[PDB]
Enzyme design. Structure first.
Site, PDB file in Angstrom:
ATOM      1  N   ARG A  83     -26.212  19.008 -37.570  1.00 27.22           N
ATOM      2  CA  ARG A  83     -24.763  18.955 -37.647  1.00 27.22           C
ATOM      3  C   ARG A  83     -24.269  20.242 -37.071  1.00 27.22           C
ATOM      4  O   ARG A  83     -24.618  21.316 -37.568  1.00 27.22           O
ATOM      5  CB  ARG A  83     -24.355  18.872 -39.119  1.00 27.22           C
ATOM      6  CG  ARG A  83     -22.887  19.148 -39.387  1.00 27.22           C
ATOM      7  CD  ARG A  83     -22.480  18.771 -40.815  1.00 27.22           C
ATOM      8  NE  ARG A  83     -21.107  19.199 -41.091  1.00 27.22           N
ATOM      9  CZ  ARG A  83     -20.763  20.416 -41.510  1.00 27.22           C
ATOM     10  NH1 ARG A  83     -21.686  21.345 -41.732  1.00 27.22           N
ATOM     11  NH2 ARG A  83     -19.484  20.706 -41.725  1.00 27.22           N
ATOM     12  N   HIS A 129     -13.890  22.974 -36.736  1.00 25.12           N
ATOM     13  CA  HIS A 129     -14.374  23.723 -37.899  1.00 25.12           C
ATOM     14  C   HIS A 129     -13.713  25.092 -37.904  1.00 25.12           C
ATOM     15  O   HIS A 129     -14.392  26.101 -37.814  1.00 25.12           O
ATOM     16  CB  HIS A 129     -15.901  23.834 -37.861  1.00 25.12           C
ATOM     17  CG  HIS A 129     -16.523  24.265 -39.154  1.00 25.12           C
ATOM     18  ND1 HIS A 129     -17.693  23.708 -39.632  1.00 25.12           N
ATOM     19  CD2 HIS A 129     -16.159  25.212 -40.054  1.00 25.12           C
ATOM     20  CE1 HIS A 129     -18.026  24.304 -40.763  1.00 25.12           C
ATOM     21  NE2 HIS A 129     -17.105  25.206 -41.050  1.00 25.12           N
ATOM     22  N   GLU A 175     -13.767  20.408 -43.714  1.00 26.15           N
ATOM     23  CA  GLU A 175     -13.044  21.152 -44.777  1.00 26.15           C
ATOM     24  C   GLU A 175     -11.603  21.560 -44.450  1.00 26.15           C
ATOM     25  O   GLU A 175     -11.246  22.729 -44.516  1.00 26.15           O
ATOM     26  CB  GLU A 175     -13.808  22.413 -45.169  1.00 26.15           C
ATOM     27  CG  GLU A 175     -15.172  22.113 -45.660  1.00 26.15           C
ATOM     28  CD  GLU A 175     -15.639  23.077 -46.709  1.00 26.15           C
ATOM     29  OE1 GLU A 175     -15.088  24.180 -46.837  1.00 26.15           O
ATOM     30  OE2 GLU A 175     -16.571  22.721 -47.425  1.00 26.15           O
ATOM     31  N   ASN A 310     -18.851  17.887 -48.752  1.00 33.72           N
ATOM     32  CA  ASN A 310     -19.478  19.179 -48.852  1.00 33.72           C
ATOM     33  C   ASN A 310     -19.446  19.634 -50.291  1.00 33.72           C
ATOM     34  O   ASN A 310     -18.360  19.677 -50.901  1.00 33.72           O
ATOM     35  CB  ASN A 310     -18.673  20.143 -48.026  1.00 33.72           C
ATOM     36  CG  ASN A 310     -18.732  19.819 -46.546  1.00 33.72           C
ATOM     37  OD1 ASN A 310     -19.444  18.886 -46.107  1.00 33.72           O
ATOM     38  ND2 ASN A 310     -18.014  20.629 -45.744  1.00 33.72           N
ATOM     39  N   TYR A 312     -20.925  22.401 -53.425  1.00 33.07           N
ATOM     40  CA  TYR A 312     -21.589  23.666 -53.763  1.00 33.07           C
ATOM     41  C   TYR A 312     -21.684  23.933 -55.251  1.00 33.07           C
ATOM     42  O   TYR A 312     -22.699  24.447 -55.722  1.00 33.07           O
ATOM     43  CB  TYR A 312     -20.878  24.846 -53.079  1.00 33.07           C
ATOM     44  CG  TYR A 312     -21.107  24.821 -51.612  1.00 33.07           C
ATOM     45  CD1 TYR A 312     -22.255  25.404 -51.076  1.00 33.07           C
ATOM     46  CD2 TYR A 312     -20.211  24.170 -50.753  1.00 33.07           C
ATOM     47  CE1 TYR A 312     -22.512  25.344 -49.733  1.00 33.07           C
ATOM     48  CE2 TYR A 312     -20.463  24.111 -49.414  1.00 33.07           C
ATOM     49  CZ  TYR A 312     -21.618  24.708 -48.902  1.00 33.07           C
ATOM     50  OH  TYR A 312     -21.888  24.680 -47.545  1.00 33.07           O
ATOM     51  N   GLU A 378     -22.701  18.791 -46.312  1.00 38.09           N
ATOM     52  CA  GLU A 378     -23.027  20.171 -46.644  1.00 38.09           C
ATOM     53  C   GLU A 378     -23.431  20.298 -48.077  1.00 38.09           C
ATOM     54  O   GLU A 378     -22.770  19.749 -48.967  1.00 38.09           O
ATOM     55  CB  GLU A 378     -21.832  21.090 -46.445  1.00 38.09           C
ATOM     56  CG  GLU A 378     -21.594  21.487 -45.008  1.00 38.09           C
ATOM     57  CD  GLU A 378     -20.518  22.528 -44.893  1.00 38.09           C
ATOM     58  OE1 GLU A 378     -20.275  23.209 -45.912  1.00 38.09           O
ATOM     59  OE2 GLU A 378     -19.925  22.660 -43.804  1.00 38.09           O
TER      60      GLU A 378
HETATM   61  O1  BGC Z   1     -19.094  28.779 -48.098  1.00 45.76           O
HETATM   62  C1  BGC Z   1     -20.265  28.357 -47.432  1.00 45.76           C
HETATM   63  C2  BGC Z   1     -19.881  27.353 -46.342  1.00 45.76           C
HETATM   64  O2  BGC Z   1     -18.885  26.568 -46.928  1.00 45.76           O
HETATM   65  C3  BGC Z   1     -18.544  25.439 -46.178  1.00 45.76           C
HETATM   66  O3  BGC Z   1     -17.490  24.842 -46.866  1.00 45.76           O
HETATM   67  C4  BGC Z   1     -18.040  25.777 -44.778  1.00 45.76           C
HETATM   68  O4  BGC Z   1     -17.935  24.577 -44.026  1.00 45.76           O
HETATM   69  C5  BGC Z   1     -18.979  26.768 -44.099  1.00 45.76           C
HETATM   70  O5  BGC Z   1     -18.372  27.141 -42.874  1.00 45.76           O
HETATM   71  C6  BGC Z   1     -19.264  27.931 -45.063  1.00 45.76           C
HETATM   72  O6  BGC Z   1     -20.130  28.871 -44.481  1.00 45.76           O
END
Ligand code: BGC
Length: 470
Positions: A83, A129, A175, A310, A312, A378
């Site tokens: 990607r 992006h 995002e 995405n 985290y 992501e």
């Molecule tokens: O924060 C870590 C990563 O977050 C993602 O939401 C973004 O797309 C990346 O560009 C960023 O490096």
């Protein structure tokens, strides 16, 4: 039941595994090969105080020159897909056609795509992006102006024309939540407005509105003008963070958590689902939230072949106790349930590791939005900051290895739940330029030696991915 055991053979044969990057974060050659500047070049150069260590992406990790090396690493890695994003100001230095079409920039993406294909790796390509061309920013305010919609379509069209014969998976945006909120509400990302000098109560809403319009119009262009001849698919990638009610059994916190999802994910998902913003955003933002025309609503509704999520981290949420996006949500984020954090910190104090969240965000998106095809575009984690370690110590990323195992496992759980996930992309392939945080925040499965021409060396996590997901 044990996530350290998860592997390709727990997934369907056609499941796509991959890694990711974005142009500004890895390419470098910012003034090479005819590339024009983006708002991020401008931000990092004019306002190096906004970047940890005052760095920028002039050279980043030099994938502009080292793309053959990234392709070789991708080949050795053995995963299906890669990607990456196209830098708008690389192929169109002035952002619109009138600023000229950069043949050498096109040639770079062709070389990358050809390299990827000759090695059996599928390119997944994101058009935007965050590197808005400075020329558009300067001429009319970039995404603050509806003029961005037409210019972005002409860019999407150039890309479909040049690369569409070989690229079959497109995302218009990555995002836009992050882009809108940190560019225009907090002012921490390019173009750095919001902390007329900005207005965190109005601008994020116009930005998001235009982002949505840009996305819808580029999808319509692809669907109507390229899809039959080219037979690819087009979607969009959204920022997500799981929102868990602070108190399991409090009506107020359940609503607050749902509102938080509404202001982050609903904000973009509802327009592309029903052609309107979430009810709670309408109620809490009132007249500062723009209205779509019926024509725009028709264009936005169902405007994707797939959605990339995405993921985290997660947060507890509770109700709150002039105007700003941040205060509009009317929630308070909490990390701790009686001195028990939702999960441990990574290298970053904002990234609390809560693997189940990826599962709940998938389950929530199918339920609320009824998306038929989902990719985790992501998911990843950053290393503890430590310039003391040799490469052999640095590359033993136990925490990432576990983070990936645990999240990939939860993706598998989401799929058992009924969520149709078609692939999963780790963020990132390479340690790279981590926006406001610079180089010190390492997300890569491949270590980068910043003292030595950005030498790539796989971390334990890459080895495991190769061995477990070939
Ligand atoms: O924060 C870590 C990563 O977050 C993602 O939401 C973004 O797309 C990346 O560009 C960023 O490096």
């Amino acid at each position: 039941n044990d996530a350290t055991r998860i592997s390709r053979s727990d997934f369907p044969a056609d499941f796509i595994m991959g890694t990711g990057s974005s142009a500004y974060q890895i390419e470098g050659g910012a003034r090479d090969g005819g590339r024009g500047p983006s708002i991020w070049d401008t931000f990092t150069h004019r306002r190096p105080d906004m970047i940890r260590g005052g760095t920028n992406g002039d050279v980043a990790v030099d994938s502009y020159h080292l793309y053959k090396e990234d392709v070789n690493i991708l080949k050795n890695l053995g995963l299906d897909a890669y990607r990456f994003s196209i830098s708008w100001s690389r192929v169109l230095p002035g952002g619109r056609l009138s600023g000229g079409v950069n043949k050498e920039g096109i040639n770079y993406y062709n070389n990358l795509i050809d390299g990827l294909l000759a090695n059996g790796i599928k390119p997944f390509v994101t058009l935007f992006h965050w590197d808005v061309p400075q020329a558009l920013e300067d001429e009319y305010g970039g995404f603050l102006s509806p003029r961005i919609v037409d210019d972005f379509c002409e860019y999407a069209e150039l890309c479909f024309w040049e690369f569409g014969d070989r690229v079959k998976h497109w995302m218009t945006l990555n995002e836009p939540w992050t882009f809108s909120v940190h560019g225009y509400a907090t002012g921490l990302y390019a173009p750095g407005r919001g902390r007329s000098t900005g207005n965190p109560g109005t601008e994020p809403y116009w930005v998001t509105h235009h982002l949505l319009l840009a996305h819808a119009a580029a999808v319509e262009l692809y669907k109507n003008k390229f899809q039959r001849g080219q037979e690819g698919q087009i979607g969009i990638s959204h920022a997500t963070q799981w929102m868990e009610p602070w108190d399991e059994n409090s009506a107020s916190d359940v609503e607050a958590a749902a509102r938080a999802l509404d202001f982050m994910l609903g904000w973009f998902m509802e327009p592309i689902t029903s052609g309107d913003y979430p009810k709670s955003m309408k109620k809490f933002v009132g007249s500062r939230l723009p209205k779509f025309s019926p024509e725009q609503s028709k264009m936005l509704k169902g405007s994707y072949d797939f959605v990339g999520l995405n993921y985290y981290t997660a947060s507890y949420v509770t109700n709150a106790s002039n105007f700003s996006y941040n205060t509009d949500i009317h929630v308070t984020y909490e990390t701790d349930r009686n001195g028990v954090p939702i999960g441990p910190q990574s290298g970053s104090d904002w990234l609390l590791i809560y693997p189940e969240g990826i599962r709940k965000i998938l389950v929530y998106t199918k339920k609320t939005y009824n998306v038929p095809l989902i990719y985790v575009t992501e998911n990843g984690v950053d290393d503890v900051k430590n310039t003391n370690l040799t490469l052999s110590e640095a590359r033993k990323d136990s925490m990432r290895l576990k983070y990936l195992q645990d999240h990939i496992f939860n993706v598998r759980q989401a799929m058992n739940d009924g969520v149709n996930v078609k692939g999963y992309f780790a963020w990132s392939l390479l340690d790279n330029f981590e926006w406001g945080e610079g180089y010190g925040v390492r997300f890569g499965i491949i270590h980068i030696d910043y003292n030595d021409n950005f030498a790539r060396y796989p971390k334990d996590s890459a080895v495991w991915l190769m061995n477990s997901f070939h």
